[PDB]
């Protein structure tokens, strides 16, 4: 019994004065007023119950976000749903209102070196906490980095997140993959399921590059094209790195390519701070075993103004949970996961 330029956006007695925003993440987003807290908040209506995938992504995200508590990761403030499973058709997730995201910002604004440094610091600070919980985000990109007007940055969208599993990371050449193409690490196309922490560091390197130039560094138009963009900049992998790829099909593909030399980061980014480029290089390293880890990245000289490991907190314990559960049983776990926000007992 309240409408937003259709459709039904019914968020109960707490949240007044709706105001449409976007249409992302298989639902719809409005600004609204939190009468208990007296601040404007953001609300996403989620109607995922018709597709098993939507339900998977939704449960995964709610479980992680309710467990995490960190300044640089979006929190869930409230969840609104019907009082029974039967009546529950939609779920509304209430979060802090964030003005913009890095994707929208990069369309129109050039970043100062100071803004790049502070945004990168906050991304890595959030990622340290995520990785400390043994979780991989697996879809970091500018549109999943929320910003407010005071340059505070919060990571969102844990729909493809997974618990790290390096022992089961190996796969064959050209294995299909779901996360956003332009931010995929080279090993995804060669021999990796993206079950290790290094997958996220690559995505952060891509984001840094994009903050430096306002354009994606590796804009592949299709699955294999992505690998060739990467190789056009990094150059042919070195023998040691090629020897690490024991997958014959992936190794022979790399050996089949004509030799390409590295394109120097300062040719690519002539206006960039040289310490930023040194860190860039370390994040965009071909061999994931040689790729910098999140805590080393935080200690890099580029970030010296901000680095303070006592103020870079970690999760109080690892996270542990999947795809085998049907749409019906997923609705039930979602119902249980959101119980804490219910009025429940009222006299």
CSV table of C-alpha atoms in Angstrom, one decimal:
chain,number,residue,atom,x,y,z
A,1,UNK,CA,0.0,0.0,0.0
A,2,UNK,CA,2.7,2.5,-1.1
A,3,UNK,CA,4.0,2.9,-4.7
A,4,UNK,CA,7.2,3.9,-6.4
A,5,UNK,CA,7.0,4.8,-10.1
A,6,UNK,CA,6.1,1.2,-11.2
A,7,UNK,CA,6.0,-0.9,-8.3
A,8,UNK,CA,4.8,-2.1,-4.8
A,9,UNK,CA,7.5,-0.7,-2.5
A,10,UNK,CA,6.1,-1.5,1.0
A,11,UNK,CA,8.6,-0.9,3.8
A,12,UNK,CA,6.3,-0.6,6.8
A,13,UNK,CA,6.1,2.0,9.5
A,14,UNK,CA,9.8,2.7,9.8
A,15,UNK,CA,10.7,4.1,6.4
A,16,UNK,CA,9.0,7.2,5.0
A,17,UNK,CA,9.4,9.5,1.9
A,18,UNK,CA,10.5,7.0,-0.8
A,19,UNK,CA,12.7,8.2,-3.7
A,20,UNK,CA,13.7,6.0,-6.6
A,21,UNK,CA,17.4,5.5,-7.4
A,22,UNK,CA,18.5,2.7,-9.7
A,23,UNK,CA,17.5,-0.7,-10.9
A,24,UNK,CA,20.5,-3.0,-10.2
A,25,UNK,CA,20.9,-6.4,-8.5
A,26,UNK,CA,17.6,-8.0,-9.6
A,27,UNK,CA,15.2,-5.8,-7.8
A,28,UNK,CA,15.0,-2.0,-7.3
A,29,UNK,CA,16.5,0.7,-5.1
A,30,UNK,CA,15.0,3.7,-3.2
A,31,UNK,CA,16.2,6.3,-0.9
A,32,UNK,CA,14.1,6.5,2.3
A,33,UNK,CA,13.8,8.1,5.8
A,34,UNK,CA,14.6,6.0,8.9
A,35,UNK,CA,12.2,7.3,11.5
A,36,UNK,CA,13.9,5.5,14.4
A,37,UNK,CA,17.4,6.7,13.3
A,38,UNK,CA,16.3,10.0,11.6
A,39,UNK,CA,18.8,9.6,8.7
A,40,UNK,CA,18.1,8.8,5.1
A,41,UNK,CA,18.9,5.1,4.2
A,42,UNK,CA,19.0,3.0,1.1
A,43,UNK,CA,16.6,0.1,0.5
A,44,UNK,CA,16.8,-2.6,-2.1
A,45,UNK,CA,13.7,-4.6,-2.8
A,46,UNK,CA,14.8,-8.2,-3.7
A,47,UNK,CA,12.4,-10.6,-5.5
A,48,UNK,CA,14.6,-13.6,-6.0
A,49,UNK,CA,12.3,-16.5,-5.2
A,50,UNK,CA,11.5,-17.4,-8.9
A,51,UNK,CA,15.2,-18.2,-9.9
A,52,UNK,CA,17.4,-20.7,-8.0
A,53,UNK,CA,20.5,-18.6,-8.9
A,54,UNK,CA,19.0,-15.4,-7.5
A,55,UNK,CA,18.2,-17.2,-4.3
A,56,UNK,CA,21.8,-18.5,-4.0
A,57,UNK,CA,23.3,-15.1,-4.5
A,58,UNK,CA,20.8,-13.5,-2.1
A,59,UNK,CA,21.4,-16.1,0.7
A,60,UNK,CA,25.1,-15.9,0.2
A,61,UNK,CA,25.2,-12.2,0.4
A,62,UNK,CA,22.9,-11.9,3.4
A,63,UNK,CA,24.8,-14.5,5.4
A,64,UNK,CA,28.2,-12.8,4.8
A,65,UNK,CA,27.0,-9.3,5.3
A,66,UNK,CA,25.3,-10.1,8.6
A,67,UNK,CA,28.6,-11.8,9.8
A,68,UNK,CA,31.0,-9.0,8.7
A,69,UNK,CA,31.4,-5.8,10.7
A,70,UNK,CA,33.9,-3.3,9.1
A,71,UNK,CA,33.9,0.3,8.1
A,72,UNK,CA,34.8,-0.4,4.6
A,73,UNK,CA,32.2,-3.1,3.9
A,74,UNK,CA,28.5,-2.2,3.4
A,75,UNK,CA,26.4,-3.4,6.4
A,76,UNK,CA,22.8,-4.6,6.5
A,77,UNK,CA,20.9,-2.2,8.8
A,78,UNK,CA,17.5,-3.9,8.6
A,79,UNK,CA,15.7,-6.6,6.6
A,80,UNK,CA,12.0,-6.3,5.9
A,81,UNK,CA,9.9,-9.3,4.9
A,82,UNK,CA,6.5,-10.9,5.6
A,83,UNK,CA,6.0,-12.7,9.0
A,84,UNK,CA,5.6,-16.1,7.4
A,85,UNK,CA,7.4,-18.1,4.6
A,86,UNK,CA,4.0,-18.4,2.8
A,87,UNK,CA,3.5,-14.7,2.6
A,88,UNK,CA,7.1,-13.8,1.9
A,89,UNK,CA,7.4,-12.8,-1.9
A,90,UNK,CA,10.1,-10.1,-1.6
A,91,UNK,CA,12.8,-9.1,0.9
A,92,UNK,CA,13.9,-5.5,1.5
A,93,UNK,CA,17.5,-4.9,2.5
A,94,UNK,CA,18.1,-1.6,4.2
A,95,UNK,CA,21.7,-0.2,4.2
A,96,UNK,CA,23.5,3.1,4.8
A,97,UNK,CA,22.8,5.5,1.9
A,98,UNK,CA,25.8,6.0,-0.3
A,99,UNK,CA,25.7,8.9,-2.9
A,100,UNK,CA,27.6,7.2,-5.7
A,101,UNK,CA,29.9,4.4,-6.6
A,102,UNK,CA,33.4,4.4,-8.2
A,103,UNK,CA,31.9,3.3,-11.6
A,104,UNK,CA,29.6,6.3,-11.8
A,105,UNK,CA,32.4,8.6,-10.5
A,106,UNK,CA,34.9,7.5,-13.1
A,107,UNK,CA,32.5,8.3,-16.0
A,108,UNK,CA,32.8,12.1,-15.3
A,109,UNK,CA,35.5,12.8,-12.7
A,110,UNK,CA,39.3,12.8,-12.8
A,111,UNK,CA,40.8,11.6,-9.5
A,112,UNK,CA,43.6,13.4,-7.8
A,113,UNK,CA,46.6,11.3,-6.7
A,114,UNK,CA,45.4,11.9,-3.1
A,115,UNK,CA,41.9,10.5,-3.9
A,116,UNK,CA,43.4,7.4,-5.7
A,117,UNK,CA,45.7,6.7,-2.7
A,118,UNK,CA,42.9,7.0,-0.1
A,119,UNK,CA,40.3,5.0,-2.2
A,120,UNK,CA,43.0,2.2,-2.8
A,121,UNK,CA,43.8,2.3,0.9
A,122,UNK,CA,40.1,1.8,1.9
A,123,UNK,CA,39.6,-1.0,-0.7
A,124,UNK,CA,42.6,-2.9,0.6
A,125,UNK,CA,41.6,-2.3,4.3
A,126,UNK,CA,38.1,-3.8,3.5
A,127,UNK,CA,39.8,-6.6,1.5
A,128,UNK,CA,42.1,-7.4,4.4
A,129,UNK,CA,39.1,-8.1,6.6
A,130,UNK,CA,37.3,-10.1,3.9
A,131,UNK,CA,40.4,-12.3,3.3
A,132,UNK,CA,41.0,-12.6,7.1
A,133,UNK,CA,37.6,-14.3,7.2
A,134,UNK,CA,38.7,-16.8,4.6
A,135,UNK,CA,36.3,-15.3,2.1
A,136,UNK,CA,36.9,-14.3,-1.5
A,137,UNK,CA,34.8,-11.5,-2.9
A,138,UNK,CA,35.4,-12.7,-6.6
A,139,UNK,CA,33.6,-9.7,-8.3
A,140,UNK,CA,35.4,-6.6,-7.2
A,141,UNK,CA,35.0,-3.8,-9.8
A,142,UNK,CA,34.2,0.0,-9.7
A,143,UNK,CA,30.4,-0.5,-9.5
A,144,UNK,CA,30.8,-2.6,-6.3
A,145,UNK,CA,32.6,0.2,-4.5
A,146,UNK,CA,30.2,2.6,-2.9
A,147,UNK,CA,31.2,6.2,-2.0
A,148,UNK,CA,29.7,8.9,0.0
A,149,UNK,CA,30.3,12.7,-0.1
A,150,UNK,CA,33.1,12.5,2.4
A,151,UNK,CA,35.1,9.9,0.3
A,152,UNK,CA,34.3,7.0,2.6
A,153,UNK,CA,34.4,3.8,0.6
A,154,UNK,CA,32.4,0.6,1.2
A,155,UNK,CA,32.7,-2.7,-0.7
A,156,UNK,CA,29.4,-4.3,-1.6
A,157,UNK,CA,27.8,-7.2,-3.6
A,158,UNK,CA,29.0,-10.5,-2.1
A,159,UNK,CA,26.7,-12.5,-4.4
A,160,UNK,CA,29.5,-14.5,-6.0
A,161,UNK,CA,31.7,-14.6,-2.8
A,162,UNK,CA,33.1,-18.0,-1.7
A,163,UNK,CA,35.1,-19.5,1.1
A,164,UNK,CA,38.7,-19.8,0.0
A,165,UNK,CA,39.7,-23.3,-1.2
A,166,UNK,CA,43.2,-23.3,-2.8
A,167,UNK,CA,43.5,-27.1,-2.7
A,168,UNK,CA,40.6,-27.3,-5.2
A,169,UNK,CA,41.5,-24.3,-7.4
A,170,UNK,CA,42.8,-26.3,-10.4
A,171,UNK,CA,40.7,-26.7,-13.5
A,172,UNK,CA,41.2,-27.1,-17.3
A,173,UNK,CA,41.8,-24.6,-20.0
A,174,UNK,CA,39.0,-22.2,-20.9
A,175,UNK,CA,36.7,-23.2,-18.0
A,176,UNK,CA,33.6,-21.1,-17.9
A,177,UNK,CA,33.4,-18.4,-15.2
A,178,UNK,CA,30.7,-16.0,-14.0
A,179,UNK,CA,32.4,-12.9,-12.5
A,180,UNK,CA,32.8,-9.7,-14.6
A,181,UNK,CA,35.1,-10.3,-17.5
A,182,UNK,CA,37.3,-7.2,-17.4
A,183,UNK,CA,38.5,-7.8,-13.8
A,184,UNK,CA,39.3,-11.5,-14.2
A,185,UNK,CA,42.8,-12.6,-13.4
A,186,UNK,CA,44.7,-14.4,-16.2
A,187,UNK,CA,44.8,-17.8,-14.5
A,188,UNK,CA,40.9,-17.9,-14.6
A,189,UNK,CA,41.2,-18.5,-18.4
A,190,UNK,CA,44.2,-20.9,-18.0
A,191,UNK,CA,43.8,-23.2,-14.9
A,192,UNK,CA,42.0,-21.6,-12.0
A,193,UNK,CA,38.5,-21.8,-10.5
A,194,UNK,CA,39.1,-18.4,-8.7
A,195,UNK,CA,39.2,-20.1,-5.3
A,196,UNK,CA,42.2,-18.3,-4.0
A,197,UNK,CA,42.9,-14.8,-2.5
A,198,UNK,CA,45.1,-13.8,-5.4
A,199,UNK,CA,42.0,-13.5,-7.6
A,200,UNK,CA,40.8,-10.5,-5.7
A,201,UNK,CA,44.2,-8.8,-5.7
A,202,UNK,CA,44.2,-8.9,-9.5
A,203,UNK,CA,40.8,-7.2,-9.6
A,204,UNK,CA,42.1,-4.5,-7.2
A,205,UNK,CA,45.0,-3.9,-9.6
A,206,UNK,CA,42.6,-3.5,-12.5
A,207,UNK,CA,40.6,-1.0,-10.4
A,208,UNK,CA,43.8,1.0,-9.5
A,209,UNK,CA,44.6,1.2,-13.2
A,210,UNK,CA,41.1,2.4,-14.0
A,211,UNK,CA,41.4,5.1,-11.3
A,212,UNK,CA,44.7,6.2,-12.9
A,213,UNK,CA,43.2,6.7,-16.4
A,214,UNK,CA,39.4,6.6,-16.1
A,215,UNK,CA,39.2,3.6,-18.5
A,216,UNK,CA,39.4,-0.1,-17.9
A,217,UNK,CA,42.9,-1.4,-18.5
A,218,UNK,CA,41.8,-4.8,-19.9
A,219,UNK,CA,38.5,-4.4,-21.7
A,220,UNK,CA,38.1,-7.9,-23.2
A,221,UNK,CA,35.0,-8.3,-25.5
A,222,UNK,CA,34.8,-12.0,-24.9
A,223,UNK,CA,36.2,-14.8,-22.8
A,224,UNK,CA,39.6,-15.5,-24.6
A,225,UNK,CA,39.9,-11.8,-25.7
A,226,UNK,CA,40.3,-11.0,-22.0
A,227,UNK,CA,43.5,-13.1,-21.8
A,228,UNK,CA,44.9,-11.5,-24.8
A,229,UNK,CA,44.4,-7.9,-23.5
A,230,UNK,CA,46.4,-8.9,-20.4
A,231,UNK,CA,49.2,-10.4,-22.4
A,232,UNK,CA,49.3,-7.3,-24.6
A,233,UNK,CA,50.4,-5.3,-21.6
A,234,UNK,CA,52.3,-7.7,-19.4
A,235,UNK,CA,54.0,-9.4,-22.3
A,236,UNK,CA,54.8,-13.0,-22.8
A,237,UNK,CA,55.1,-14.9,-19.5
A,238,UNK,CA,58.6,-15.8,-18.4
A,239,UNK,CA,59.8,-19.4,-18.5
A,240,UNK,CA,59.5,-19.9,-14.7
A,241,UNK,CA,55.9,-18.7,-14.8
A,242,UNK,CA,55.2,-20.8,-17.8
A,243,UNK,CA,56.7,-23.8,-16.1
A,244,UNK,CA,54.2,-23.3,-13.2
A,245,UNK,CA,51.3,-24.0,-15.6
A,246,UNK,CA,51.3,-27.8,-15.8
A,247,UNK,CA,48.0,-27.9,-17.6
A,248,UNK,CA,49.4,-28.9,-21.1
A,249,UNK,CA,46.4,-27.3,-23.0
A,250,UNK,CA,46.9,-23.9,-21.2
A,251,UNK,CA,50.7,-24.1,-21.5
A,252,UNK,CA,50.6,-24.9,-25.2
A,253,UNK,CA,48.2,-22.1,-25.9
A,254,UNK,CA,50.6,-19.6,-24.3
A,255,UNK,CA,53.6,-21.1,-26.3
A,256,UNK,CA,51.6,-20.7,-29.5
A,257,UNK,CA,51.4,-16.9,-29.2
A,258,UNK,CA,54.0,-14.7,-30.8
A,259,UNK,CA,56.4,-13.1,-28.3
A,260,UNK,CA,55.2,-9.7,-26.9
A,261,UNK,CA,57.3,-7.4,-24.8
A,262,UNK,CA,56.0,-5.8,-21.6
A,263,UNK,CA,54.4,-2.3,-22.1
A,264,UNK,CA,56.1,-0.1,-19.3
A,265,UNK,CA,53.5,1.1,-16.8
A,266,UNK,CA,54.8,4.7,-17.1
A,267,UNK,CA,54.2,4.6,-20.9
A,268,UNK,CA,50.6,3.5,-20.1
A,269,UNK,CA,50.2,6.0,-17.2
A,270,UNK,CA,52.6,9.0,-17.7
A,271,UNK,CA,50.9,11.2,-15.0
A,272,UNK,CA,50.9,8.5,-12.3
A,273,UNK,CA,52.8,8.6,-9.1
A,274,UNK,CA,55.8,6.2,-9.5
A,275,UNK,CA,55.1,4.5,-6.2
A,276,UNK,CA,51.5,3.8,-7.4
A,277,UNK,CA,52.9,2.1,-10.5
A,278,UNK,CA,55.2,0.0,-8.5
A,279,UNK,CA,52.3,-1.3,-6.4
A,280,UNK,CA,50.2,-1.6,-9.6
A,281,UNK,CA,53.0,-3.9,-11.0
A,282,UNK,CA,52.9,-6.1,-8.0
A,283,UNK,CA,49.1,-6.5,-8.1
A,284,UNK,CA,49.0,-7.2,-11.8
A,285,UNK,CA,51.6,-9.9,-11.7
A,286,UNK,CA,50.9,-12.8,-14.0
A,287,UNK,CA,51.9,-15.7,-11.7
A,288,UNK,CA,49.4,-15.7,-8.8
A,289,UNK,CA,52.0,-17.2,-6.5
A,290,UNK,CA,54.2,-14.1,-7.0
A,291,UNK,CA,51.3,-11.7,-6.8
A,292,UNK,CA,51.3,-9.3,-3.8
A,293,UNK,CA,49.0,-10.3,-0.9
A,294,UNK,CA,46.6,-7.8,0.7
A,295,UNK,CA,48.7,-7.2,3.8
A,296,UNK,CA,51.9,-6.6,1.8
A,297,UNK,CA,49.9,-4.2,-0.4
A,298,UNK,CA,48.8,-2.2,2.6
A,299,UNK,CA,52.5,-1.9,3.8
A,300,UNK,CA,53.6,-0.7,0.3
A,301,UNK,CA,55.2,2.8,0.3
A,302,UNK,CA,52.4,4.2,-1.9
A,303,UNK,CA,50.1,3.8,1.1
A,304,UNK,CA,52.5,5.0,3.9
A,305,UNK,CA,50.3,8.0,4.8
A,306,UNK,CA,47.5,5.6,5.8
A,307,UNK,CA,49.1,2.3,6.8
A,308,UNK,CA,48.6,1.3,10.4
A,309,UNK,CA,48.0,-2.4,11.0
A,310,UNK,CA,46.6,-1.8,14.4
A,311,UNK,CA,43.8,0.1,12.7
A,312,UNK,CA,43.2,-2.4,10.0
A,313,UNK,CA,41.1,-5.0,11.8
A,314,UNK,CA,40.6,-8.6,11.0
A,315,UNK,CA,37.5,-10.8,11.4
A,316,UNK,CA,36.9,-12.5,14.7
A,317,UNK,CA,36.9,-16.0,13.0
A,318,UNK,CA,36.9,-17.7,9.6
A,319,UNK,CA,33.6,-17.9,7.7
A,320,UNK,CA,32.2,-21.3,6.7
A,321,UNK,CA,29.0,-22.4,4.9
A,322,UNK,CA,25.9,-24.4,-1.4
A,323,UNK,CA,24.8,-25.1,-5.1
A,324,UNK,CA,23.0,-28.4,-4.2
A,325,UNK,CA,20.1,-26.8,-2.4
A,326,UNK,CA,16.9,-26.2,-4.3
A,327,UNK,CA,15.0,-22.9,-4.7
A,328,UNK,CA,12.5,-24.0,-2.1
A,329,UNK,CA,15.0,-24.8,0.6
A,330,UNK,CA,16.9,-21.6,-0.2
A,331,UNK,CA,13.7,-19.6,0.5
A,332,UNK,CA,13.6,-21.3,3.9
A,333,UNK,CA,17.3,-20.5,4.9
A,334,UNK,CA,16.7,-16.9,3.7
A,335,UNK,CA,13.6,-16.7,6.0
A,336,UNK,CA,15.7,-18.1,8.9
A,337,UNK,CA,18.6,-15.8,8.2
A,338,UNK,CA,16.4,-12.7,8.3
A,339,UNK,CA,14.5,-13.6,11.5
A,340,UNK,CA,16.6,-11.3,13.7
A,341,UNK,CA,15.0,-8.2,12.2
A,342,UNK,CA,11.4,-9.2,12.9
A,343,UNK,CA,9.2,-7.6,15.5
A,344,UNK,CA,8.3,-11.2,16.5
A,345,UNK,CA,6.9,-10.7,20.0
A,346,UNK,CA,4.6,-7.7,20.4
A,347,UNK,CA,2.1,-7.1,23.2
